[PDB]
Amino acid sequence: SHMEQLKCCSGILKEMFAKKHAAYAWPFYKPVDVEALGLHDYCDIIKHPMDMSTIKSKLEAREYRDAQEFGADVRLMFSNCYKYNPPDHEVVAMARKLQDVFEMRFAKM
Ligand SMILES: CCS(=O)(=O)c1ccc2c(c1)-c1cn(C)c(=O)c3[nH]cc(c13)CN2CC1CC1
Structure with a gap:
């Protein structure tokens, strides 16, 4: 179920x-x-723009119908970091390390 x-x-x-x-x-x-x-x-x-606090606020306000809508917002946060910053940047390596954590937990549900 969605809930x-x-x-x-x-x-x-x-x-x-x-x-x-x-x-x-x-x-x-x-x-x-x-x-x-x-x-x-x-x-x-x-x-x-998107961030973890905004996603946490949207989740509490029930702005996501299901896991896919939540997942779309988490991936937007990472996509924005990859777009704006050069590939060599430290925040991109940090984003990749955080996305690895997310993708592992999001896949196993
Ligand atoms: C309360 C967070 S902050 O003060 O807004 C903040 C503080 C620092 C910070 C960012 C945000 C940041 C975030 N992102 C998503 C980027 O694309 C981005 N591009 C360059 C930087 C950023 C600079 N750096 C990262 C820092 C070098 C290791």
Whole structure:
């Protein structure tokens, strides 16, 4: 059922927030601070920004019908990081390490 799938999605999100993954997951915890980090081009390149806090808020507000809608938002967060930043960047390697954690848990449900 859809109600059961969303419960598993909360579990994946919680593990993504845990201390174990904090070293590489932290730049995704909250929305990207464009003005403070000096990224003016970010709003022009990234049309739909996404982060773990926004996903956690959308989950609590029941904005996802099923696991696929939740999964679409998690993958959008990673896709935005891959698009804006060059492949050699540290935040891309961090995104890949976090996506490996997500894809492993999301597949096993
Ligand atoms: C509360 C988070 S923050 O203060 O907005 C924050 C703080 C830092 C931070 C980001 C966000 C960030 C996130 N993403 C999704 C990017 O695409 C991106 N591109 C370059 C950077 C970012 C700079 N870095 C990562 C840092 C070098 C290891």
